[PDB]
Scaffold this motif. Structure first.
Motif, PDB file in Angstrom:
ATOM      1  N   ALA A  74       1.159  -1.207  -0.038  1.00  0.00           N
ATOM      2  CA  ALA A  74       0.183  -0.436  -0.372  1.00  0.00           C
ATOM      3  C   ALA A  74       0.656   1.236  -0.131  1.00  0.00           C
ATOM      4  O   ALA A  74       1.495   1.255   0.033  1.00  0.00           O
ATOM      5  N   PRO A  75      -0.062   2.593  -0.513  1.00  0.00           N
ATOM      6  CA  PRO A  75       0.937   3.647  -0.761  1.00  0.00           C
ATOM      7  C   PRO A  75       1.422   4.360   0.965  1.00  0.00           C
ATOM      8  O   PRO A  75       0.842   3.574   1.351  1.00  0.00           O
ATOM      9  N   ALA A  76       1.556   5.188   0.651  1.00  0.00           N
ATOM     10  CA  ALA A  76       1.791   6.509   1.896  1.00  0.00           C
ATOM     11  C   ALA A  76       1.392   6.973   2.287  1.00  0.00           C
ATOM     12  O   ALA A  76      -0.066   6.977   2.075  1.00  0.00           O
ATOM     13  N   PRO A  77       1.576   6.954   4.363  1.00  0.00           N
ATOM     14  CA  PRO A  77       0.043   7.848   4.540  1.00  0.00           C
ATOM     15  C   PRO A  77       0.301   9.616   4.559  1.00  0.00           C
ATOM     16  O   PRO A  77       1.321   9.241   3.928  1.00  0.00           O
ATOM     17  N   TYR A  78      -0.548   9.660   5.088  1.00  0.00           N
ATOM     18  CA  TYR A  78      -0.659  11.353   4.691  1.00  0.00           C
ATOM     19  C   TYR A  78      -1.655  11.301   5.204  1.00  0.00           C
ATOM     20  O   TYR A  78      -1.673  11.330   5.846  1.00  0.00           O
ATOM     21  N   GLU A  79      -1.699  13.460   4.948  1.00  0.00           N
ATOM     22  CA  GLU A  79      -1.939  14.246   5.726  1.00  0.00           C
ATOM     23  C   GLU A  79      -2.038  15.235   5.000  1.00  0.00           C
ATOM     24  O   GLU A  79      -1.168  16.287   3.998  1.00  0.00           O
ATOM     25  N   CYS A  80      -3.469  15.319   4.558  1.00  0.00           N
ATOM     26  CA  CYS A  80      -4.238  16.485   3.517  1.00  0.00           C
ATOM     27  C   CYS A  80      -3.469  17.594   3.894  1.00  0.00           C
ATOM     28  O   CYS A  80      -3.688  18.622   4.686  1.00  0.00           O
ATOM     29  N   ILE A  81      -2.289  18.171   2.647  1.00  0.00           N
ATOM     30  CA  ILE A  81      -2.215  19.276   2.256  1.00  0.00           C
ATOM     31  C   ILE A  81      -2.330  20.520   1.536  1.00  0.00           C
ATOM     32  O   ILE A  81      -2.398  19.900   0.989  1.00  0.00           O
ATOM     33  N   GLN A  82      -2.527  21.885   1.750  1.00  0.00           N
ATOM     34  CA  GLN A  82      -3.150  22.664   0.834  1.00  0.00           C
ATOM     35  C   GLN A  82      -2.705  22.771  -0.330  1.00  0.00           C
ATOM     36  O   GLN A  82      -1.235  22.748  -0.287  1.00  0.00           O
ATOM     37  N   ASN A  83      -3.036  23.177  -1.744  1.00  0.00           N
ATOM     38  CA  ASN A  83      -1.836  22.962  -2.970  1.00  0.00           C
ATOM     39  C   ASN A  83      -2.275  24.826  -2.887  1.00  0.00           C
ATOM     40  O   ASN A  83      -3.550  25.556  -2.672  1.00  0.00           O
ATOM     41  N   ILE A  84      -0.957  24.681  -3.749  1.00  0.00           N
ATOM     42  CA  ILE A  84      -1.207  26.898  -4.193  1.00  0.00           C
ATOM     43  C   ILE A  84      -0.053  26.538  -5.126  1.00  0.00           C
ATOM     44  O   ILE A  84       0.706  25.249  -5.419  1.00  0.00           O
ATOM     45  N   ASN A  85      -0.408  27.043  -6.494  1.00  0.00           N
ATOM     46  CA  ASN A  85      -0.210  27.477  -7.544  1.00  0.00           C
ATOM     47  C   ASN A  85       1.492  28.387  -8.056  1.00  0.00           C
ATOM     48  O   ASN A  85       0.409  29.715  -7.829  1.00  0.00           O
ATOM     49  N   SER A  86       2.484  27.839  -7.638  1.00  0.00           N
ATOM     50  CA  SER A  86       3.267  29.333  -7.995  1.00  0.00           C
ATOM     51  C   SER A  86       3.556  30.075  -9.170  1.00  0.00           C
ATOM     52  O   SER A  86       3.114  31.334  -8.790  1.00  0.00           O
ATOM     53  N   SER A  87       3.361  29.135 -10.296  1.00  0.00           N
ATOM     54  CA  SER A  87       3.211  30.272 -11.284  1.00  0.00           C
ATOM     55  C   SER A  87       1.942  30.425 -11.827  1.00  0.00           C
ATOM     56  O   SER A  87       2.086  31.981 -12.001  1.00  0.00           O
ATOM     57  N   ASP A  88       1.422  29.482 -12.059  1.00  0.00           N
ATOM     58  CA  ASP A  88      -0.001  30.356 -12.293  1.00  0.00           C
ATOM     59  C   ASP A  88      -0.704  31.532 -11.334  1.00  0.00           C
ATOM     60  O   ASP A  88      -0.807  30.892 -10.522  1.00  0.00           O
ATOM     61  N   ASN A  89      -0.822  32.875 -12.362  1.00  0.00           N
ATOM     62  CA  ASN A  89      -1.314  33.219 -10.762  1.00  0.00           C
ATOM     63  C   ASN A  89      -3.163  32.804 -10.802  1.00  0.00           C
ATOM     64  O   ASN A  89      -4.028  33.012  -9.940  1.00  0.00           O
ATOM     65  N   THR A  90      -3.651  32.882 -11.789  1.00  0.00           N
ATOM     66  CA  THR A  90      -4.851  32.232 -12.137  1.00  0.00           C
ATOM     67  C   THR A  90      -5.612  31.024 -11.331  1.00  0.00           C
ATOM     68  O   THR A  90      -7.098  30.634 -11.389  1.00  0.00           O
ATOM     69  N   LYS A  91      -4.669  30.097 -10.634  1.00  0.00           N
ATOM     70  CA  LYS A  91      -5.378  28.724 -10.447  1.00  0.00           C
ATOM     71  C   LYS A  91      -5.899  29.721  -9.046  1.00  0.00           C
ATOM     72  O   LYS A  91      -6.718  29.443  -8.379  1.00  0.00           O
ATOM     73  N   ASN A  92      -4.948  30.351  -8.298  1.00  0.00           N
ATOM     74  CA  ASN A  92      -4.722  30.607  -6.760  1.00  0.00           C
ATOM     75  C   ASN A  92      -6.288  31.804  -6.358  1.00  0.00           C
ATOM     76  O   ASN A  92      -6.434  31.958  -7.159  1.00  0.00           O
ATOM     77  N   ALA A  93      -6.935  30.726  -4.853  1.00  0.00           N
ATOM     78  CA  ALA A  93      -8.233  32.026  -5.207  1.00  0.00           C
ATOM     79  C   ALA A  93      -7.080  33.235  -4.310  1.00  0.00           C
ATOM     80  O   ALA A  93      -7.068  33.402  -3.807  1.00  0.00           O
TER      81      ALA A  93
END
Lengths: 521, 104, 521, 104
Positions: free
Chosen positions: A258-277
């Motif tokens: 089975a794959p690794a454990p995880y803790e959900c981490i928020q995502n953020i798009n550094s280069s593309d301006n139009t993605k981030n809130a």
């Protein structure tokens, strides 16, 4: 030992590749100011104002100062690093030697007209290495002060302080400690003397330096089908229906690992301006872990894949990835063009994307009349039969960290990177002994607070012994390797990448990880 | 405490039965009538322990375990950690093993 | 070791005079009850009622019991004592052996009709000697319980208790101690076993056994006169006048040495009724010394001469002289005919009479117009150049005492008498192990309070080694010696002095000191 | 402390005089004019002590010296037995050597 005229040591810088092991050696020049006028202060910040109650601390300051040589780019050069990571799939430290010499002490005299600097022949520095780990160990916090990348520059040793336990509002308590550093044996160095020191590391596992060319969800021969059977549903009557997993659908297969454990981490798009809130708050969106009634950031946290193949460009985790500066600078809030932002694509085989949040588990018990229902999980921790890969060691990142001394620890590896160690290289402290100013004629029982202003300087060399693995892989087609693609550069402005720019500063162009070699799971 | 794969074995004891007077004629059934008795004696236990003595260079004095009780009337409670009036032994307060400060 | 049938030891009583040393040996029979039902109690008496606040104490009780063999008349017989004190001028202890054997344990069964005593074959006693002096040492307090004078009688071992520090009103405090005696190693004795023990004393000075035939105020050749001159007064003009000390007045002589220090002790005439005042209070007339906020009797205090030659008969100090009973008895207030009251006339040479209060010293500074004035002193303590003689050792008095362990002590000798010792003979404790009564069927976690009533008995022997001094004195005329002058005795009533009377009790007629031999200063 | 017939000797030190420039002609008087100076350096002291460790069989726990101060503000007094705010070293409370109970 020898007199003023003779030199106490000579410059050594080389890297020789002897075999399965390599030896690096380097020498730099340092300068040690006199800190705090030879006084121990207490220091605290109560949580009443400014940052908040989570920022409170209490501790002491010390006139002593110390060498922090722990980063990779002290011991390697961008060329020698390249030579390492393309050929060799692993590295671990073996032992090290460290020597400091050519000390000379100078004294400042201010007339208020101008400053005068006159070389003092008789005066000493005090230096000792702590074997028994009696002092608080402040290395491994990734603080500044490490040797410069480039051997020419001269650097300034940092002051030594530490934080003990605290009550409420940043006050001392019973368990609090106070360490007098003069209570340690040391060695006084006067011009013509040198300090030598020897160390040998404990056995540690090689760091895996290979990117991985398979995935867990495909470990299988795609042309075949299993002899295990699985449940494809139920009939309309309620009978059970079976289905065999064939090559037409490979997600059905029963799988061993089975794959690794995880803790959900928020995502953020550094280069593309139009993605981030718009106008998200970094402090309020970050994973935290609380301790002792207050809560501090959890970053980077356990490693997760920054981006996977096929995902939108510029995709990254928020505070889940290391970040560095092009060059050493004191700016508190640098611009985006001055920072190297690493990305983890080499582990995408075992480790899931950070914010994916795909996993699903059944939340209810079926029976007549009620349908089975499932739901996604925001945190999924370790269970038997999982595999994961540790975070990479960058050229600019820390080499080692000290495993805290505790009853128990689970798979110790530093979350930032490098080699966890029970006994790390000891911390080497130095100070320049006080010289009192002219006393009064009559006896005064009070202690003497008036001193002669002075500073010290000299050279220090560090010799590392590394152990590497060279490999043989039979894949036919050519692997990817680290190469320099920059088109052109104007010497009137930026100079050569990884080279001194116009104004004399040294600039590190782009971050460099160690996994360029594909090796199958 | 200490988790162990093989712990100290468990020591069991019983006092063998002595039957009461049987009937004259043969009865194949087993005999349920016994002589009431009990046993007594002494037992000793000898432990060997391994300890660590340390050297810590902190300047200021550590906390240690001391007995702060102000006073006690022998007419009632006797001395703490000592036999009270009625002959029972009383353990005043719990005692843990961590009194020495050592930095992480 | 050996079985039930064989005997574990045999009777030994003898005294043999080998030379400069003598060996005494004796054997007696003891009986040990079960104390306190095998329980430690605390005990206290608050000063609220009865005696008063000075009587408060706090301590513990113990099921254990012990042998106290410390008195002289255990080891000697009135004949052998006589043989000692007439010929020999000094004695000190050398070493001793002690052995206990022929233990047998019996069990009492009460039917309420009558008691039954049936010999138990299997049961043990516990006995150990304390080498390291870890327990409080309660010997040397001159308490009862010592072996009987006369070997035939059977005696009962005393219980063991002790007194710790106390707060106000007899309460425990922080420094208070609690000693669990089962925490000591011991030896279990069952019938057929024996316990042997060995000891050797430290070096101590011989006790002076001679009365002294001179005085300090006459050390001089009476026919001569000194070459020192002394001041006999002043003229009417104020000039100084000289006088030489001749044989006509021997009190003038300058003298090298001074007599003993003293504390005035009230005098009381035992035999003569018409001397004593009417209805004096013994408690309010006695010298006291206070400690820790309360005050206890000082008796006997430092030795003083009871009476001097020429003084009225029956003259004695109040609580300054030891007193004994004709025979062991439990009476709290015996009649005057039942007590032996010692007197000290042998030291009248060096030591002053107790209540004399003769000493005189000058209280003012003379000059023109003022006459010199002097006054008597009620207490006069030690100064350089004094001499004194210690209190005598009676046949009935204690042998030794344990010097308290303290920073400092001044000429340690027990004020009651005997040999002060740093390490005295250890204290030997014994108890008979508990045997529980029939338990209930089901498990009860509580401890078991129900026991079988029993007691033990057996023999104990003690072997002393003494070192004596025999002397040669050339005086012409015959010395005084201790002889038995009683005219006659009716066997119908008192029997022979120092012999069993009509009713079977042993009676000690008169006290016996050790100084009968005159020897000049 | 310890009374001694021969105590550790007393160690004295001074810095030798350096005269200022004399006059040209001979002056028989002694020279009172000197160059102002001072000295400095380090001194080490090594003591050898002899101690007694003991065994006492009392059951209940003894009192011992521990640090009971509740809290301290580093803005003012710092840690007891530690440097306060202004850089001075402060000794909180006196410490005697008798904490162990031992019977007379």
């Amino acid at each position: 030992a020898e007199g003023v005229g003779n030199s106490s040591g000579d410059w050594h810088c080389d890297t020789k590749w002897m075999g399965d092991h390599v030896i690096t050696k380097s020498t730099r020049t340092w300068v040690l100011p006199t800190y705090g006028n030879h006084l121990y202060g207490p220091i605290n910040f109560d949580g009443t104002t400014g940052s908040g109650a989570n920022a409170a601390y209490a501790g002491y300051k010390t006139p002593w100062g110390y060498f922090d040589f722990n980063r990779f780019h002290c011991h390697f050069s961008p060329r020698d690093w390249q030579r390492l990571i393309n050929n060799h799939t692993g590295i671990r430290p073996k032992g090290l030697k460290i020597k400091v010499f050519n000390v000379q002490v100078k004294e400042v005299t201010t007339q208020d007209s101008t400053k005068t600097i006159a070389n003092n022949l008789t005066s000493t520095v005090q230096i000792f290495a702590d074997e028994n780990y009696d002092l608080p160990y402040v290395l491994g916090s990734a603080t500044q002060g490490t040797f410069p990348p480039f051997p020419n520059d001269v650097f300034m040793l940092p002051q030594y302080a530490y934080c003990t336990l605290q009550g409420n509002s940043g006050k001392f308590v019973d368990r609090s400690a106070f360490y007098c550093l003069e209570y340690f044996p040391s060695q006084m160095l006067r011009t013509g003397n040198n300090f030598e020191f020897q160390f040998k590391f404990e056995e540690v596992p090689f760091h895996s330096g290979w990117a991985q060319s398979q995935s867990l969800d495909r470990l299988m021969n795609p042309l075949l089908d299993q002899y295990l059977i699985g449940d494809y549903g139920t009939d309309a009557s309620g009978n059970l229906i079976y289905h065999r997993a064939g090559p037409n659908d490979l997600n059905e297969f029963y799988k061993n690992w089975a794959p690794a454990p995880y803790e959900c981490i928020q995502n953020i798009n550094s280069s593309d301006n139009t993605k981030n809130a718009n106008s998200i708050n970094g402090s309020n969106s970050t994973n935290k872990w609380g301790l002792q009634g207050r809560q501090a950031w959890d970053a980077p946290g356990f490693v997760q894949a920054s981006t996977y193949e096929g995902a939108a460009a510029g995709q990254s985790l928020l505070n889940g990835v290391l970040t560095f500066d092009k060059s050493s600078a004191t700016t508190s809030s640098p611009a985006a063009t001055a920072v190297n932002r690493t990305i983890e694509d080499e582990i995408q085989g075992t480790n899931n994307f950070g914010n994916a949040r795909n996993n699903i588990v059944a939340i209810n018990q079926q029976t007549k009349g009620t349908n089975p229902t499932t739901g996604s999980t925001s945190q999924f921790e370790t269970m038997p039969g999982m595999v994961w890969s540790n975070r990479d060691i960058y050229l600019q990142g820390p080499i080692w960290a000290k495993i805290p001394n505790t009853d128990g620890h689970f798979h110790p590896s530093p979350r930032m990177g490098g080699f966890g160690l029970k006994h790390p290289p000891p911390m080497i402290l130095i100070k320049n002994t006080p010289v009192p100013a002219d006393p009064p004629t009559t006896f005064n029982p009070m202690p003497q607070t008036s001193f002669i202003t002075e500073y010290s300087t000299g050279q220090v060399t560090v010799e590392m012994l590394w152990e590497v693995q060279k490999e043989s892989s039979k894949r036919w087609n050519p692997e990817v390797q680290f190469t320099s693609n920059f088109g052109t550069s104007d010497p009137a402005v930026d100079g050569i990448p990884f080279g001194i720019n116009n104004l004399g500063t040294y600039v590190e162009s782009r971050p460099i990880g160690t996994r360029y070699i594909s090796k199958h799971l």
